[PDB]
Amino acid sequence: QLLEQSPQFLSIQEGENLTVYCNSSSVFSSLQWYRQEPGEGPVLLVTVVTGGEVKKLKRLTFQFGDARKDSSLHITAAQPGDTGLYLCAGAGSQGNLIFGKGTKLSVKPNIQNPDPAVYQLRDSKSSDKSVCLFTDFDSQTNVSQSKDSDVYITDKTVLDMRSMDFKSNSAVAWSNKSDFACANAFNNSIIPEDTFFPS
Amino acid sequence: MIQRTPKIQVYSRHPAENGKSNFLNCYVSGFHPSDIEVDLLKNGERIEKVEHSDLSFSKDWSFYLLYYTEFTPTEKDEYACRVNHVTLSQPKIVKWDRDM
Amino acid sequence: GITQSPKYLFRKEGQNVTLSCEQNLNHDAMYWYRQDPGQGLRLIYYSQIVNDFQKGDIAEGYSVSREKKESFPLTVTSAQKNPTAFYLCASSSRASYEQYFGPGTRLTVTEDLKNVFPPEVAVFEPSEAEISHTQKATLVCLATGFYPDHVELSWWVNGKEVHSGVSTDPQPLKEQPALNDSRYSLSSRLRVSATFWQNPRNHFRCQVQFYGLSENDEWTQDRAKPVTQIVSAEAWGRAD
Amino acid sequence: GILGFVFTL
Amino acid sequence: GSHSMRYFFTSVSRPGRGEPRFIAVGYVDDTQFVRFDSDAASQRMEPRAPWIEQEGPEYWDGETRKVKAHSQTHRVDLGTLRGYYNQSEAGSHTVQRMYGCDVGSDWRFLRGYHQYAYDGKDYIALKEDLRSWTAADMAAQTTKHKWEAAHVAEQLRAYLEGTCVEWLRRYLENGKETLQRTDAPKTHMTHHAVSDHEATLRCWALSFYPAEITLTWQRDGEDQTQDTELVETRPAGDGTFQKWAAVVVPSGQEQRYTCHVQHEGLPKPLTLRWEP
């Protein structure tokens, strides 16, 4: 027995509708779906049994193929709480579950007014010492990693100001190196031509 | 609790002929529980080279077994099966009838 | 429910260690999996019924037992030279039916206990340029120099924990990538309004819980022993 | 060949 | 003609403290081909026919592993049933289990089975639709509600219709020199007097394969069950079977009676009588 999942990766926008796939050559008597965040226990979402059955949970809609050889998972108006690894599994003849290798989903916020900028922040309880902050760019901008082993660049993360109803991407870079300037920190990535670099 | 006494039959593998090697069998069947004692006897005495089949059951759940030994029939020799079970008050003898 | 403890475990190379798994769900079957970073689940060993177990797909250098319905312990022996991983236990009512997973355990195996280090923690204040350009103010926390990467970061405003306006990096960075047991760095951001940051009555704090050495372990070094401990840094609002 | 999965009454 | 595969499991408890015993046997039609016994030395599934001996070590290791799992399941089941029925730990109790498949002349799926007994009597059975259960009483209703919620019937139906039928076709080809054979009975008649108005005739069938046979008495017209004593088909021990049918008739009319033999090894059904 073998289950194959497709696509391996999907990265889309807040409010999009999407479908992900699970396939076999052989028939399963019961099939499950799970959602996992990294460093955490997978959460069981559904068990399906009857060929052709449809089930709904929250924003999710699950379908079992009529011959019982495949299943699909559909999200309506996807939201950043849907981000994660989605795994299908089925009853095995030797007393276990057969697992697929998964589909990893990211759902991205819509940035209504992008304002790409790099700023410098000072250490609070210290002289010297500082970080560089690339913030307010759109969700299609790629942040590369450094050509230097002496410079540290993070991936981007998303932050949510819930009472003001506002979201933003940011990356962080720092170094001990003595010539290091926020002006040249992000030189390795494709960066917006109109990025604000304070005078 | 549903108990059942064994059916008992004694016979030979091939038609009996005098001085020709052969096998003596005791078929026990239709009994419950499975605990059962079976001896084959020659002129009233236990035969000590007896084998049996693996424990199996019928459509209706009752048990069956085949006990057997190699033998050579003669004119004066008498043969039998001796059986005990939880449903019997004392063991029970059935005799080999050579037209059978 | 189904429980694993502890959340984080840490050992020297060559040391046999046993991981716990208990459930009072009344289930007959139990399963163990290992998972590497950005990878899928891999079946190690399983048990369809009390007093019986059987091998999964990657069983070499591990063992199990099942003397009781409630419990299914896993021993990582001087296994393969691949023991560092995320370990997950699961249970089902009968074998082949839907599984319920425990919360998980992170195990890290080290070359040497002299490689263990606690984090240092620093807060960086919001730039002036951001404030006038956006009327917003982003603080950044850095935790650096820790091994193993077994940490939990939180932000505190006026004595209370916050989750609004926060994002923490999903994974740490290795400081020396060429080195097998490299130390790690991690960043977080907190973003407030400019009027909130300019209030000198507002107090902000970055806190990191580290999991490190025990009272069992020796320490014969000249530096303080890298035990489980909390490390903080703070700031107060500033007017203009 | 016999069943590869088992279950209690 | 038609063919079948069956497995039979017996599990028995003892007083105390004393450990329970477990036996499993397997059959293709009427020919036993494997066994397992918890009281025996090997602790392995073992061969009982010469054609199964041509399976290699992967086959033997997999049957052994699967049967030990079976055996620990029914160990738990014995304690569960003594709880459902409010019994004590001083007695001896019995659970039995049978499952398997039938095929036709074409060697294609025909029927499937999976059922249990406790202390002699029916406990729970899968129906012929392979979708629903028959529970015999209040305790077995608890077993039914538990197997419905965990979807046991759906996984069993896949085995019985597919896997089971594939093992059987493989065994029929490998065992062709003996499994495919059909042996016609060698027949005869015996006569003993009891008194002066009645005497016993007895119709004999020997050395046939398979076990399935019909022996019926008639006089002028058709069937009668008046002292029509018949004994259960019994094994000869060399892989063939034997049977007899006997009636006690009014002495003098010992020529109006005819014995009838129906077997699939016979080109044409047999009618025979006693000659003076």
PDB file of C-alpha atoms in Angstrom, chain C residues 7-206:
ATOM      1  CA  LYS C   7       8.579  18.121  26.573  1.00  0.00           C
ATOM      2  CA  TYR C   8      12.377  18.437  26.208  1.00  0.00           C
ATOM      3  CA  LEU C   9      15.052  15.777  26.900  1.00  0.00           C
ATOM      4  CA  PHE C  10      18.848  16.007  26.587  1.00  0.00           C
ATOM      5  CA  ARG C  11      21.666  13.356  26.751  1.00  0.00           C
ATOM      6  CA  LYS C  12      25.350  12.509  25.939  1.00  0.00           C
ATOM      7  CA  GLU C  13      26.202  10.165  23.038  1.00  0.00           C
ATOM      8  CA  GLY C  14      26.371   6.517  24.245  1.00  0.00           C
ATOM      9  CA  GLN C  15      23.714   6.920  26.968  1.00  0.00           C
ATOM     10  CA  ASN C  16      20.613   4.681  26.701  1.00  0.00           C
ATOM     11  CA  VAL C  17      17.411   6.772  27.350  1.00  0.00           C
ATOM     12  CA  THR C  18      13.693   5.679  27.740  1.00  0.00           C
ATOM     13  CA  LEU C  19      10.724   7.911  26.765  1.00  0.00           C
ATOM     14  CA  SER C  20       7.269   7.759  28.470  1.00  0.00           C
ATOM     15  CA  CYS C  21       3.783   7.284  26.908  1.00  0.00           C
ATOM     16  CA  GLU C  22       0.539   6.855  28.891  1.00  0.00           C
ATOM     17  CA  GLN C  23      -3.177   6.955  28.060  1.00  0.00           C
ATOM     18  CA  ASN C  24      -6.448   6.472  29.989  1.00  0.00           C
ATOM     19  CA  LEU C  25      -8.521   6.453  26.791  1.00  0.00           C
ATOM     20  CA  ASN C  26      -9.186   2.651  26.993  1.00  0.00           C
ATOM     21  CA  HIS C  27      -7.350   1.994  23.684  1.00  0.00           C
ATOM     22  CA  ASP C  28      -5.840  -1.342  22.580  1.00  0.00           C
ATOM     23  CA  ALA C  29      -3.169  -0.133  20.125  1.00  0.00           C
ATOM     24  CA  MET C  30      -0.088   2.127  20.487  1.00  0.00           C
ATOM     25  CA  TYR C  31       2.494   3.450  17.920  1.00  0.00           C
ATOM     26  CA  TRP C  32       5.872   5.340  17.947  1.00  0.00           C
ATOM     27  CA  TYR C  33       7.128   7.697  15.189  1.00  0.00           C
ATOM     28  CA  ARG C  34      10.241   9.784  14.618  1.00  0.00           C
ATOM     29  CA  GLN C  35      10.236  13.073  12.603  1.00  0.00           C
ATOM     30  CA  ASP C  36      13.172  15.118  11.255  1.00  0.00           C
ATOM     31  CA  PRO C  37      12.947  18.931  10.405  1.00  0.00           C
ATOM     32  CA  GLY C  38      10.678  19.691   7.387  1.00  0.00           C
ATOM     33  CA  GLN C  39      10.273  15.903   6.873  1.00  0.00           C
ATOM     34  CA  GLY C  40       7.405  13.401   7.339  1.00  0.00           C
ATOM     35  CA  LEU C  41       6.597  10.780   9.984  1.00  0.00           C
ATOM     36  CA  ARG C  42       8.545   7.528  10.129  1.00  0.00           C
ATOM     37  CA  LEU C  43       7.145   4.427  11.895  1.00  0.00           C
ATOM     38  CA  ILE C  44       9.591   2.906  14.445  1.00  0.00           C
ATOM     39  CA  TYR C  45       7.599   0.179  16.418  1.00  0.00           C
ATOM     40  CA  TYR C  46       3.908  -0.709  17.209  1.00  0.00           C
ATOM     41  CA  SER C  47       1.646  -2.809  19.425  1.00  0.00           C
ATOM     42  CA  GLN C  48      -1.888  -4.045  18.441  1.00  0.00           C
ATOM     43  CA  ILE C  49      -2.659  -5.578  21.885  1.00  0.00           C
ATOM     44  CA  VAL C  50      -1.102  -5.849  25.405  1.00  0.00           C
ATOM     45  CA  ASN C  51       1.780  -8.386  25.700  1.00  0.00           C
ATOM     46  CA  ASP C  52       2.684  -8.182  21.863  1.00  0.00           C
ATOM     47  CA  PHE C  53       4.712  -5.705  19.670  1.00  0.00           C
ATOM     48  CA  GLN C  54       6.140  -5.594  16.068  1.00  0.00           C
ATOM     49  CA  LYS C  55       8.700  -3.600  13.976  1.00  0.00           C
ATOM     50  CA  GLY C  56       7.863  -0.585  11.777  1.00  0.00           C
ATOM     51  CA  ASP C  57      10.064   0.752   8.919  1.00  0.00           C
ATOM     52  CA  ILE C  58      13.088   2.166  10.899  1.00  0.00           C
ATOM     53  CA  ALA C  59      13.399  -0.176  13.930  1.00  0.00           C
ATOM     54  CA  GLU C  60      17.205  -0.588  14.067  1.00  0.00           C
ATOM     55  CA  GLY C  61      18.737   0.512  17.440  1.00  0.00           C
ATOM     56  CA  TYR C  62      15.390   0.996  19.330  1.00  0.00           C
ATOM     57  CA  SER C  63      13.344  -1.344  21.597  1.00  0.00           C
ATOM     58  CA  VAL C  64       9.828  -1.442  23.243  1.00  0.00           C
ATOM     59  CA  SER C  65       7.621  -3.232  25.808  1.00  0.00           C
ATOM     60  CA  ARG C  66       3.847  -3.563  26.549  1.00  0.00           C
ATOM     61  CA  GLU C  67       3.241  -5.258  29.981  1.00  0.00           C
ATOM     62  CA  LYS C  68       0.222  -2.978  30.582  1.00  0.00           C
ATOM     63  CA  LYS C  69      -2.598  -1.549  28.377  1.00  0.00           C
ATOM     64  CA  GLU C  70      -2.012   2.069  29.606  1.00  0.00           C
ATOM     65  CA  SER C  71       1.771   2.321  28.920  1.00  0.00           C
ATOM     66  CA  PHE C  72       4.178   1.912  25.939  1.00  0.00           C
ATOM     67  CA  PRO C  73       7.827   2.969  26.799  1.00  0.00           C
ATOM     68  CA  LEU C  74      10.482   3.590  24.032  1.00  0.00           C
ATOM     69  CA  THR C  75      14.248   2.959  24.615  1.00  0.00           C
ATOM     70  CA  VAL C  76      16.736   4.746  22.329  1.00  0.00           C
ATOM     71  CA  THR C  77      19.861   2.543  22.644  1.00  0.00           C
ATOM     72  CA  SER C  78      23.380   3.574  21.579  1.00  0.00           C
ATOM     73  CA  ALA C  79      21.108   3.196  18.476  1.00  0.00           C
ATOM     74  CA  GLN C  80      22.088   4.204  15.053  1.00  0.00           C
ATOM     75  CA  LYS C  81      24.256   7.283  14.877  1.00  0.00           C
ATOM     76  CA  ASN C  82      21.017   9.182  14.160  1.00  0.00           C
ATOM     77  CA  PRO C  83      19.194   9.679  17.539  1.00  0.00           C
ATOM     78  CA  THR C  84      18.409  13.495  17.499  1.00  0.00           C
ATOM     79  CA  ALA C  85      14.744  13.880  16.492  1.00  0.00           C
ATOM     80  CA  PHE C  86      11.110  14.780  17.399  1.00  0.00           C
ATOM     81  CA  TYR C  87       9.367  11.716  19.005  1.00  0.00           C
ATOM     82  CA  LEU C  88       5.574  11.206  18.802  1.00  0.00           C
ATOM     83  CA  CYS C  89       3.356   8.518  20.464  1.00  0.00           C
ATOM     84  CA  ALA C  90      -0.236   7.717  19.381  1.00  0.00           C
ATOM     85  CA  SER C  91      -3.104   5.384  20.309  1.00  0.00           C
ATOM     86  CA  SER C  92      -6.120   3.861  18.629  1.00  0.00           C
ATOM     87  CA  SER C  93      -9.152   1.934  19.981  1.00  0.00           C
ATOM     88  CA  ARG C  94      -8.304  -1.080  17.682  1.00  0.00           C
ATOM     89  CA  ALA C  95      -5.286  -1.333  15.259  1.00  0.00           C
ATOM     90  CA  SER C  96      -5.741   0.257  11.718  1.00  0.00           C
ATOM     91  CA  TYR C  97      -8.417   2.766  12.994  1.00  0.00           C
ATOM     92  CA  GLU C  98      -8.010   6.603  13.677  1.00  0.00           C
ATOM     93  CA  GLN C  99      -5.004   7.531  15.848  1.00  0.00           C
ATOM     94  CA  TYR C 100      -4.882  10.232  18.665  1.00  0.00           C
ATOM     95  CA  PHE C 101      -1.399  11.778  19.145  1.00  0.00           C
ATOM     96  CA  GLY C 102       0.355  12.884  22.364  1.00  0.00           C
ATOM     97  CA  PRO C 103       2.004  16.341  22.614  1.00  0.00           C
ATOM     98  CA  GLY C 104       5.544  15.175  21.591  1.00  0.00           C
ATOM     99  CA  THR C 105       9.106  15.066  22.968  1.00  0.00           C
ATOM    100  CA  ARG C 106      12.232  16.762  21.598  1.00  0.00           C
ATOM    101  CA  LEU C 107      15.448  14.734  22.187  1.00  0.00           C
ATOM    102  CA  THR C 108      18.901  16.207  21.428  1.00  0.00           C
ATOM    103  CA  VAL C 109      22.068  14.027  21.697  1.00  0.00           C
ATOM    104  CA  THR C 110      25.399  15.840  22.247  1.00  0.00           C
ATOM    105  CA  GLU C 111      29.121  15.091  21.731  1.00  0.00           C
ATOM    106  CA  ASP C 112      30.069  16.591  25.129  1.00  0.00           C
ATOM    107  CA  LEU C 113      28.251  18.344  28.043  1.00  0.00           C
ATOM    108  CA  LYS C 114      30.856  21.175  27.725  1.00  0.00           C
ATOM    109  CA  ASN C 115      28.862  22.193  24.630  1.00  0.00           C
ATOM    110  CA  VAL C 116      25.881  23.314  26.775  1.00  0.00           C
ATOM    111  CA  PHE C 117      25.282  27.063  27.091  1.00  0.00           C
ATOM    112  CA  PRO C 118      22.344  29.244  28.341  1.00  0.00           C
ATOM    113  CA  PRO C 119      21.035  32.203  26.290  1.00  0.00           C
ATOM    114  CA  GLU C 120      21.940  35.857  26.746  1.00  0.00           C
ATOM    115  CA  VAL C 121      18.937  38.190  26.130  1.00  0.00           C
ATOM    116  CA  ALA C 122      18.757  41.801  24.915  1.00  0.00           C
ATOM    117  CA  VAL C 123      15.989  44.266  23.996  1.00  0.00           C
ATOM    118  CA  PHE C 124      16.468  46.915  21.251  1.00  0.00           C
ATOM    119  CA  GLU C 125      14.286  50.097  21.378  1.00  0.00           C
ATOM    120  CA  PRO C 126      12.127  51.436  18.459  1.00  0.00           C
ATOM    121  CA  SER C 127      13.809  53.753  15.938  1.00  0.00           C
ATOM    122  CA  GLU C 128      12.776  57.417  15.711  1.00  0.00           C
ATOM    123  CA  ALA C 129      12.609  57.181  11.880  1.00  0.00           C
ATOM    124  CA  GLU C 130       9.920  54.444  12.041  1.00  0.00           C
ATOM    125  CA  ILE C 131       7.829  56.467  14.569  1.00  0.00           C
ATOM    126  CA  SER C 132       7.461  59.619  12.441  1.00  0.00           C
ATOM    127  CA  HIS C 133       7.202  57.625   9.161  1.00  0.00           C
ATOM    128  CA  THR C 134       4.445  55.263  10.460  1.00  0.00           C
ATOM    129  CA  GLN C 135       3.172  56.406  13.902  1.00  0.00           C
ATOM    130  CA  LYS C 136       4.139  52.829  14.972  1.00  0.00           C
ATOM    131  CA  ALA C 137       7.018  51.457  17.146  1.00  0.00           C
ATOM    132  CA  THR C 138       8.697  47.983  16.773  1.00  0.00           C
ATOM    133  CA  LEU C 139      10.834  46.482  19.614  1.00  0.00           C
ATOM    134  CA  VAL C 140      13.197  43.534  18.820  1.00  0.00           C
ATOM    135  CA  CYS C 141      14.363  40.774  21.273  1.00  0.00           C
ATOM    136  CA  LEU C 142      17.575  38.689  20.598  1.00  0.00           C
ATOM    137  CA  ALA C 143      18.421  35.432  22.398  1.00  0.00           C
ATOM    138  CA  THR C 144      21.961  34.278  21.416  1.00  0.00           C
ATOM    139  CA  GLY C 145      24.581  31.653  22.377  1.00  0.00           C
ATOM    140  CA  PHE C 146      22.299  28.768  23.412  1.00  0.00           C
ATOM    141  CA  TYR C 147      22.792  25.009  22.980  1.00  0.00           C
ATOM    142  CA  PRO C 148      20.732  22.924  22.878  1.00  0.00           C
ATOM    143  CA  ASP C 149      17.897  24.706  21.044  1.00  0.00           C
ATOM    144  CA  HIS C 150      15.330  23.958  23.812  1.00  0.00           C
ATOM    145  CA  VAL C 151      13.793  27.401  24.653  1.00  0.00           C
ATOM    146  CA  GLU C 152      10.449  29.268  25.123  1.00  0.00           C
ATOM    147  CA  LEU C 153      10.176  33.074  24.483  1.00  0.00           C
ATOM    148  CA  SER C 154       7.398  35.438  25.778  1.00  0.00           C
ATOM    149  CA  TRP C 155       6.707  39.238  25.975  1.00  0.00           C
ATOM    150  CA  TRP C 156       5.284  41.034  29.145  1.00  0.00           C
ATOM    151  CA  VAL C 157       3.638  44.537  29.329  1.00  0.00           C
ATOM    152  CA  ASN C 158       2.782  46.124  32.755  1.00  0.00           C
ATOM    153  CA  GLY C 159       2.979  42.718  34.489  1.00  0.00           C
ATOM    154  CA  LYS C 160       0.824  40.853  31.909  1.00  0.00           C
ATOM    155  CA  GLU C 161       1.682  38.444  29.025  1.00  0.00           C
ATOM    156  CA  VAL C 162       0.844  39.625  25.475  1.00  0.00           C
ATOM    157  CA  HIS C 163       0.212  37.847  22.111  1.00  0.00           C
ATOM    158  CA  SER C 164      -1.210  40.760  20.092  1.00  0.00           C
ATOM    159  CA  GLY C 165       1.463  42.497  17.948  1.00  0.00           C
ATOM    160  CA  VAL C 166       3.965  39.604  18.393  1.00  0.00           C
ATOM    161  CA  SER C 167       5.839  37.340  15.855  1.00  0.00           C
ATOM    162  CA  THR C 168       8.691  34.889  16.840  1.00  0.00           C
ATOM    163  CA  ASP C 169      10.997  33.185  14.211  1.00  0.00           C
ATOM    164  CA  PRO C 170       9.757  29.611  13.505  1.00  0.00           C
ATOM    165  CA  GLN C 171      13.371  28.251  13.611  1.00  0.00           C
ATOM    166  CA  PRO C 172      16.743  29.395  15.071  1.00  0.00           C
ATOM    167  CA  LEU C 173      19.958  30.138  13.162  1.00  0.00           C
ATOM    168  CA  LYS C 174      23.198  28.169  13.591  1.00  0.00           C
ATOM    169  CA  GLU C 175      26.120  30.426  14.594  1.00  0.00           C
ATOM    170  CA  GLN C 176      28.858  28.110  13.132  1.00  0.00           C
ATOM    171  CA  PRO C 177      27.231  25.973  10.311  1.00  0.00           C
ATOM    172  CA  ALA C 178      30.462  23.919   9.712  1.00  0.00           C
ATOM    173  CA  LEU C 179      30.384  22.616  13.367  1.00  0.00           C
ATOM    174  CA  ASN C 180      28.291  19.585  14.385  1.00  0.00           C
ATOM    175  CA  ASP C 181      27.051  21.036  17.773  1.00  0.00           C
ATOM    176  CA  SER C 182      26.751  24.694  16.806  1.00  0.00           C
ATOM    177  CA  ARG C 183      25.146  27.247  19.199  1.00  0.00           C
ATOM    178  CA  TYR C 184      21.904  29.047  18.109  1.00  0.00           C
ATOM    179  CA  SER C 185      20.322  32.556  17.842  1.00  0.00           C
ATOM    180  CA  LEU C 186      16.596  33.572  17.869  1.00  0.00           C
ATOM    181  CA  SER C 187      14.666  36.847  17.236  1.00  0.00           C
ATOM    182  CA  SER C 188      11.177  38.181  18.127  1.00  0.00           C
ATOM    183  CA  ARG C 189       9.287  41.491  17.433  1.00  0.00           C
ATOM    184  CA  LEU C 190       6.685  43.451  19.451  1.00  0.00           C
ATOM    185  CA  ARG C 191       4.878  46.349  17.667  1.00  0.00           C
ATOM    186  CA  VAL C 192       2.786  48.957  19.544  1.00  0.00           C
ATOM    187  CA  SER C 193       1.350  52.407  18.672  1.00  0.00           C
ATOM    188  CA  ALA C 194       3.670  55.432  19.021  1.00  0.00           C
ATOM    189  CA  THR C 195       1.513  56.967  21.802  1.00  0.00           C
ATOM    190  CA  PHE C 196       1.847  53.708  23.823  1.00  0.00           C
ATOM    191  CA  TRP C 197       5.712  53.674  23.532  1.00  0.00           C
ATOM    192  CA  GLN C 198       5.914  57.411  24.467  1.00  0.00           C
ATOM    193  CA  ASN C 199       4.087  56.773  27.803  1.00  0.00           C
ATOM    194  CA  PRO C 200       6.842  56.656  30.473  1.00  0.00           C
ATOM    195  CA  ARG C 201       4.456  54.618  32.759  1.00  0.00           C
ATOM    196  CA  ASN C 202       4.573  51.611  30.359  1.00  0.00           C
ATOM    197  CA  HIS C 203       7.002  48.785  31.221  1.00  0.00           C
ATOM    198  CA  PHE C 204       8.073  46.085  28.596  1.00  0.00           C
ATOM    199  CA  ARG C 205       9.885  42.747  29.170  1.00  0.00           C
ATOM    200  CA  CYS C 206      11.385  39.890  26.988  1.00  0.00           C
TER     201      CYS C 206
END
